Amino acid sequence: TPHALLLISIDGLRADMLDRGITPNLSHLAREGVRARWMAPSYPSLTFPNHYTLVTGLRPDHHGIVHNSMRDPTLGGFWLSKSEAVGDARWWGGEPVWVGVENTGQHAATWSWPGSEAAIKGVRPSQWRHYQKGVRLDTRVDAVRGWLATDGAQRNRLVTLYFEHVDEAGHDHGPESRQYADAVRAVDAAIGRLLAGMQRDGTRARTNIIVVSDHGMAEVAPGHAISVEDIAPPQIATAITDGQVIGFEPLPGQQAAAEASVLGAHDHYDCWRKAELPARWQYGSHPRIPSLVCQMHEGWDALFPDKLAKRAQRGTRGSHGYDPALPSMRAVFLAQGPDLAQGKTLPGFDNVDVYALMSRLLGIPAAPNDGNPATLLPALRM
Numbered sequence: 325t326p327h328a329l330l331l332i333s334i335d336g337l338r339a340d341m342l343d344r345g346i347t348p349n350l351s352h353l354a355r356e357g358v359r360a361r362w363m364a365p366s367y368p369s370l371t372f373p374n375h376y377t378l379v380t381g382l383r384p385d386h387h388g389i390v391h392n393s394m395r396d397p398t399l400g401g402f403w404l405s406k407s408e409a410v411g412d413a414r415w416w417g418g419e420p421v422w423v424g425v426e427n428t429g430q431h432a433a434t435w436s437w438p439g440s441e442a443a444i445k446g447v448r449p450s451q452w453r454h455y456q457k458g459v460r461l462d463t464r465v466d467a468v469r470g471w472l473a474t475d476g477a478q479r480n481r482l483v484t485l486y487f488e489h490v491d492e493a494g495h496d497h498g499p500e501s502r503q504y505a506d507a508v509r510a511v512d513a514a515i516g517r518l519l520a521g522m523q524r525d526g527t528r529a530r531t532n533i534i535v536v537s538d539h540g541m542a543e544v545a546p547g548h549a550i551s552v553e554d555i556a557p558p559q560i561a562t563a564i565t566d567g568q569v570i571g572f573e574p575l576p577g578q579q580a581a582a583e584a585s586v587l588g589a590h591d592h593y594d595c596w597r598k599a600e601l602p603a604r605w606q607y608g609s610h611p612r613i614p615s616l617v618c619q620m621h622e623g624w625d626a627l628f629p630d631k632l633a634k635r636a637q638r639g640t641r642g643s644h645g646y647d648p649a650l651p652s653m654r655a656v657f658l659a660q661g662p663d664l665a666q667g668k669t670l671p672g673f674d675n676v677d678v679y680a681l682m683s684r685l686l687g688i689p690a691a692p693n694d695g696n697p698a699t700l701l702p703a704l705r706m
């Protein structure tokens with residue numbers, strides 16, 4: 325029987341948070357195994373795009389999950405709480421690792437990884453669910469522990485686990501807040517309980533473990549929110565998305581007026597025609613990307629006008645979705661297990677490179693991807 329892979333995502337865990345004395349279990353895991361200095365997200369530095377990049381090895385411009393919120397001429401609208409969009413395979417390009425696993429006759433079990441609610445390339449994981457808010461830490465940990473222990477025809481080569489708590493605390497209170505640190509500690513402790521349970525089950529010694537995040541988190545101090553209609557008024561363009569990556573579609577005949585309003589450098593953002601976006605972001609060819617794309621500067625939000633109004637203007641908040649090269653946006657990568665190196669540190673690298681490692685650890689042929697297989701070869705035990 326080949327070694328299983330446990331893939332854990334801690335949404336919004338910034339790379340530097342491993343070095344603050346608040347992650348005893350993950351710090352121990354990293355010392356036993358391999359730790360990268362940091363892992364850069366792909367553009368845009370948002371949840372759905374990056375989780376899907378992690379499991380496909382494709383940049384969002386290629387896999388088609390180009391934002392958390394999208395429009396498509398054929399498929400219509402997509403956003404995180406539109407279940408029949410999220411569950412519709414036609415949105416999701418490439419081949420995520422769970423599809424690769426199932427196609428070899430092996431099985432995958434997912435606790436709410438973006439894309440796992442669809443039948444991508446026709447293939448669902450063996451275990452999966454519709455993601456719902458407020459599930460207990462023990463509920464998901466005990467499920468994952470179960471899925472790793474299963475034998476016979478329900479044995480799982482791949483098991484995935486996801487935590488939202490650090491991201492949620494970061495948005496509500498900022499990454500330097502006691503709330504963000506408390507969430508980090510809680511998730512770390514839950515992971516400690518999973519590891520101890522795997523050891524009692526005898527699954528620990530035959531399971532490779534990868535812990536990642538999708539992106540980091542930056543502070544958004546009071547007064548750092550504008551309206552998307554400050555960028556372009558609604559009669560000349562429609563804001564398709566708000567937040568930090570702001571897509572605009574000019575109204576009919578209004579392309580020139582929209583460009584006059586939007587293009588170039590502004591106080592706390594910059595905008596480009598999608599074909600002219602900075603080359604380093606490798607983004608803007610996909611048809612689902614709006615004609616005009618604005619990038620908010622680090623620490624600023626641009627909101628739909630009704631949100632800006634209900635934004636309770638008091639305290640410090642957090643956001644991501646900023647330039648992926650920023651230190652604040654850096655994510656985590658660590659790995660440990662029977663097939664992985666021991667007491668190793670790796671340079672910072674791009675998240676597209678994780679897929680090649682996982683495909684090797686899962687015994688699946690690597691689908692074509694945007695990563696470099698060389699990058700994480702040093703993570704292997706030999």
Ligand code: VO4
Nearest residue numbers: 335370371372491
């Ligand atoms: O769903 V996310 O782009 O806010 O961490």
Ligand SMILES: [Zn+2]
Nearest residue numbers: 335336371538
């Ligand atoms: Zn996220």
Ligand SMILES: [Zn+2]
Nearest residue numbers: 336491495644
């Ligand atoms: Zn977030």
